[model samples]
Target: GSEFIKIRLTVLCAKNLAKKDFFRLPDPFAKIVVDGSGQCHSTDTVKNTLDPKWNQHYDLYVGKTDSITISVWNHKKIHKKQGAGFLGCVRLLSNAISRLKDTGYQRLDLCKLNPSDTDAVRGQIVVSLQTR
Candidate 1:
């Protein structure tokens, strides 16, 4: 816990994302908004899967932001009329994250629910956050 500390956030997967098209599921990706620096980090897009696993990792300087936004989006092919679509987002505070086991991962359960069916799930995201 010093000035030279670093933290890596590993994005593992997301499940049960809603299908945007009748024939295809949304190609999803994730973004970690670090301290409003405007230098957001992202993961690769996995096409046509409601359940996507990335196992991608991003490193960050420690003790920067009091709040961090981890968001999920659906990517589409380049077109004048369309762009990335947002699925779900969650904010994490350092105090909450500090409890993460040094060697294990934490699961983020996205409450992005279906409107008509309250029991429906939007999806879930798994990530490993640890000191490095």
Candidate 2:
């Protein structure tokens, strides 16, 4: 008996972001973490695109009580290691698992990088969550 449902999500794209480099568009990527499991799936980093397009799809899992944490990052190089930029984090509630479509898509609003600013549409995430 399988207790987990399959989640097929497509990472579409994002729009307008703060510049990470002085004269270049930042390299950006999206990270998907599930159930605080420390396991993260990442999209390929787009080079120098403030508004990036990611045509990547992932097959994920969600239990009845599990949640997901999604983050968009400004990937940078510091000492030859990956440095991060402060992109917003979105937490999908457990109930989201049940409200998704079996084969449809929607756009989700991304929470602001700064929670107290009250006004800034940093960007958004487009995804299609499908269950089969």
Candidate 3:
């Protein structure tokens, strides 16, 4: 039997993001991933803004016990092949998954790759989640 449910996501906006470049603000975007599920999704990029409004949405099937991670990055087109300027990320473990949609929209702070780390990068992303 299928044990997965479709999860709806709304990538609303981000505020007070850290700047990666000296002369210009970041062209930021959002990345979504599910633990143990090799799939990745991204939202459209908003250019030259400390505060970005994506208002993008997506639907992904996920298991009840699976973990979800959403990351924000400062994107550059001409910076060679090093890496994206990582702003931060938020991870939702099983404990918080069940109550996400019921809680309505959330303003989750962006943190280091390890969600357990108390240290934050410097911004927050607003999003809404629901299960179907």
- Candidate No. with top TM-score: 3
- Decoy 1 TM-score against native: 0.77
Q: Each model's TM-score, in the order given?
A: 0.77, 0.80, 0.87
Runs of candidate 1 exceeding 4 Å displacement:
1-4, 36-38, 77-84, 101-103, 112-121
lDDT per residue for candidate 1 within 83-122, as digits (tens), equals 3366776666766656762757777877542345333347
Worst 10 contiguous positions by lDDT, candidate 1: 112-121
Ranking by lDDT: 3, 2, 1
Report lDDT (CA) for all predictions.
Answer: 0.71, 0.71, 0.82
- State which candidate, 1 or 2, has the greater lDDT: 2
Q: How many residue pairs clash in each candidate?
A: 0, 0, 0
Question: Residue 124 in model 2: shift from native, Å?
Answer: 0.9
Q: What is the C-alpha lDDT profile of model 2 across 25-122, one tens digit per residue?
A: 67888888778344579999998887788978887777767777777877774235443465565777778756865646667777864678543336
| Candidate that would win on lDDT | 3
Write the number of the candidate with greater TM-score, choosing between 1 and 2: 2
Task: Write down the worst ten-residue block by lDDT for model 3.
Answer: 76-85
